[PDB]
Design a protein around this nucleic acid. Sequence first.
RNA 1: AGGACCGAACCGACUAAUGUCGAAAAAUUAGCGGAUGACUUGUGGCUGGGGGUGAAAGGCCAAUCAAACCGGGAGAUAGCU
RNA 2: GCUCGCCGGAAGACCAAGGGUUCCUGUCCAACGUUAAUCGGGGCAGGGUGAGUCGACCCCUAAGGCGAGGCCGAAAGGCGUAGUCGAUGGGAAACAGGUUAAUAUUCCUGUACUUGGUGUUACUGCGAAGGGGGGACGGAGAAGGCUAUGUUGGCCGGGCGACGGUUGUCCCGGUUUAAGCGUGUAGGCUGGUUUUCCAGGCAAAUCCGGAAAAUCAAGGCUGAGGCGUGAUGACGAGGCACUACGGUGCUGAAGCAACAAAUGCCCUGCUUCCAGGAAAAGCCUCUAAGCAUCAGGUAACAUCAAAUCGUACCCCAAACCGACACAGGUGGUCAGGUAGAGAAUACCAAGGCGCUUGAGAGAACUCGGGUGAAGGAACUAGGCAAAAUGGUGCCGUAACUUCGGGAGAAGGCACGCUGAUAUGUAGGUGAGGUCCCUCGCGGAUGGAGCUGAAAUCAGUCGAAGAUACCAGCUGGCUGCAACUGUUUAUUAAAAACACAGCACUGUGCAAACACGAAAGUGGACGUAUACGGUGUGACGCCUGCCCGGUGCCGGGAGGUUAAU
RNA 3: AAUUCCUUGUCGGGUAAGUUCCGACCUGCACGAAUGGCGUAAUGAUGGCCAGGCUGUCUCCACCCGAGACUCAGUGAAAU
RNA 4: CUUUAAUGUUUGAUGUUCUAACGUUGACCCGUAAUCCGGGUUGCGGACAGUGUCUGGUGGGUAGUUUGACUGGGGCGGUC
Lengths: 46, 271
Amino acid sequence: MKRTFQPSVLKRNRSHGFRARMATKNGRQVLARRRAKGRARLTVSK
Amino acid sequence: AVVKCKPTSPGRRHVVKVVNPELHKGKPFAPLLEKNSKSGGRNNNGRITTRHIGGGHKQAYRIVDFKRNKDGIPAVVERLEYDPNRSANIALVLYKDGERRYILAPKGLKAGDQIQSGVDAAIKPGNTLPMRNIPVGSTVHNVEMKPGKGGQLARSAGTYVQIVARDGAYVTLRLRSGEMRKVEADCRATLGEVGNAEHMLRVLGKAGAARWRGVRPTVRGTAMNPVDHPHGGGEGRNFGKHPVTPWGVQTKGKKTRSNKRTDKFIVRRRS
RNA sequence: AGGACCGAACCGACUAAUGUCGAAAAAUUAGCGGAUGACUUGUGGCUGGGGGUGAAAGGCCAAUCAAACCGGGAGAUAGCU
RNA sequence: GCUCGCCGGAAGACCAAGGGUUCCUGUCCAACGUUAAUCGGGGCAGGGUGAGUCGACCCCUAAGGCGAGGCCGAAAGGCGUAGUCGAUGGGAAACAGGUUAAUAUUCCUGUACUUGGUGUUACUGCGAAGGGGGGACGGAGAAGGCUAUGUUGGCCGGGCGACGGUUGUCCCGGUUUAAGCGUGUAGGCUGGUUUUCCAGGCAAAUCCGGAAAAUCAAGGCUGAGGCGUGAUGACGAGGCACUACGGUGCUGAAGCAACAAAUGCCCUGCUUCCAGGAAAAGCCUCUAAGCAUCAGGUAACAUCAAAUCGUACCCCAAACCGACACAGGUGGUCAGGUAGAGAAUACCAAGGCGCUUGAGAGAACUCGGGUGAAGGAACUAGGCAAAAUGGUGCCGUAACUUCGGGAGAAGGCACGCUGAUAUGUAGGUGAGGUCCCUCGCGGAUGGAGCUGAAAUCAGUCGAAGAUACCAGCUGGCUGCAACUGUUUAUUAAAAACACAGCACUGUGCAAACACGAAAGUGGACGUAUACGGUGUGACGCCUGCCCGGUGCCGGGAGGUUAAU
RNA sequence: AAUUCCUUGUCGGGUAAGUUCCGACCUGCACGAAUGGCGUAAUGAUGGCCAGGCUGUCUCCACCCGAGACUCAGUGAAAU
RNA sequence: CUUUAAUGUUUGAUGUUCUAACGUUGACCCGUAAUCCGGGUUGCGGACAGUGUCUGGUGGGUAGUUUGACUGGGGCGGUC
């Protein structure tokens, strides 16, 4: 059984990386909400 | 030539091949080649616009000369090649100045034949002449709608258009569809009929031929659910509805021609 | 030459048995069909919700789909328990 | 430490993705390991990752993303040019041995290679986002030359041996050596040399292409392998001396021939097929602008630099995804010996493991199997499951048929071992000698030597010789569907879906149709022998009547008919 | 008949026994000609029936080989 | 005033011709090492096509809704 999650750091970074988030304002709004909530991990990164 | 394969097995039982012995058995002219990435029916938005398109063997686009701007330059037909993009076969043409191009191959053209474009052209097949110079009552192919466009009529295999009348600056052309169209005389045209007239004889044998030719399976409306198609639904193959397109437009005998712009050039419709 | 034949890798699950608080939130054993093509697979992208895709079953869309998930209207309304 | 068992196309070794110190040592059983534990992938401390040649990095780019100007859109934003990203691809270079408890193609020893800067020497025209060649390509299939690899023989060192014999045609282990350099063959491709001209290559060109000629008929490109050097070097069985008794130092003989042979190289090769099989950069060449006492380039020499990042460990698993130390899933590479057609199957080498609860007894019952008296489907919805055949060679093979098939139809006989044919045949390979040579990796004879099926006779042991694993049950009637194929991941694989064919209809190309407030796209860089929709579904007979109701097309005589 | 209430329609084959199957008739509730009718070689992990071998499916179960079940030592849940 | 007629006037519906609006997903040149876009010339259509407001018709394609109650198995039948 191949489960839903098949890790691939390149895909992770290119789909949920900070650059991708800032590419569109919606991701910028997500980042703003994360900062307002004060999460230590703003996004997924090494 | 048309040949029928022996029924060595199902799939080969109904295969009828269209073999052209004189075609070039070698690589095409690389300088005139161009990449042709498939779209699979997708568009800029990426959604499927036209269905039943996808897959198929890779094919490289050939830059085929249509406008034929080499006026007054005699040229020789080096050889004939099969163009996957077009339904007919293309011909490599070398001009006296030392350049090679591709043209549509008429029925009467073969290797080593002489052709020439421009107004000062004869009536032999392959020559390019405006309808004003072309005598009335002749069959032509690769005709232009406007000067310099390149050519849009009679580009398939074994097709042609007949010159019927001459209304001064305009010429009447009967197309293979029975359409009587009016075209400005300044437009160019090529004499003769396109080659590979036996294109209909091919039957493709099996599913795989169409599958790798670029056509995907077609699903009938009756087999679809009501949520997707206007047809379908009901136990036991029930239709109870007039034929309609998947999008609600009534098909099977409903004219979709609403332009009112080019109708001035339309003399008669199909019948 | 074959959308050919028998048959390994590979793909799938047609039958039986076990397992249903199981080794496993559909699995294991022997049979089973394809195995040069309409085949399969690795990598990278495109098609985003009344929308996508769909050889079409109302099938799949992150173990959830006759309309996914996340937050808000919202302490929706409930003559009901 | 010695026995017994398992994998060995893996249950072995490398990696890619994915983890982040799980890797080694010292130290402890507080918590975890489905039991204990001194043990561990557990707790604490220390050490460990060395690159011009590996990869990333970097030049170019496909699908695709972003997108200066620009178009459109209430705003957000959507499309898109020039440009820039984007490896799943193309571009330059290293191999052998040794070493740590943990690194090695990185460190040490030896031999090399590639790209640029600087300087010296001798020549010379250089010079591009520009032009040309190359880069540069599909499916299927056959042969030949080879190699990795394996078998045998000779040689070397040792042994003759606890239950019979083993100085003999006997047994054990080795017989390995790279990259680079020069020769360049087997093979493949292509006709060359010279002159003149041309509106072509969006301007030019000595470059490409084309047109004329005189000459020879060869030249040129690519190209595995083998051969010498690399290498009187490393490695090498075994022996010798000390052992914190795990281990360290010295020494070190032969290192050859034949056969078979690959899915790996010649091969991006060669022959056919239609489904016609990426792009750009590096690289060679030509010139525009500008300079040609310069600058720049070429050839030889010396020197400098090649930065930065990962290098441990697991990587078919205890370390990745499955909440677990989970009978599941995970891409590529090497993958040997015997029997075997085979990467199947049976036993093994190398290498890795006995899967983290066991000790007793041998109740019913459950799970996986073995055997079975007589009947052989009488059990059951149903031959469900089980049982049975199963391979090679030879003879033979029905009805129908689209003449291909059915068919491996069905159905009949021989398979072990030894001797002879033949002190191993046919066949394959092929030494030395002899003769030529357009003289070397050259051509004939020749068979030394090695390998080596298939078949006949005779004999012989066994109840059975395809003796183990592996390995179709068979035929007839019959509905469905032409067939192959796909579907409800996770109760339905089918008569359902799809299919090649057929018929109607729409579209003249700023085409119809669909995504989009619109741009713009697919259709299509295609075009009536082209594309979309509909219904049926190979092939043969065909597809009868009906226009009243509802759609579609054409008509306008006459009545109604909004905005204005 | 993949269509049929009456129905297991009537007749012959297959078994001694056949609501299934094959062939013949049509009294077609309620087949029918491209939402196709009629045949069709080959094809099918397709539906039904029959015949040959085979056997533990069964008459009717019996023994044996391994893991559970049972006893001991250590760890130690659940539904309710 | 009922009935008519040349001239000059308001003009509308229709027909033919022209271009100066508009279209050009026709050709050439430039911004530009540019299939985008804009500009300049030309050709072809041309007051057509197309767009904006109102308006007649079609419009289960899409969106919001309804489909009463009594009713002894259900609906039917019957009543309000």
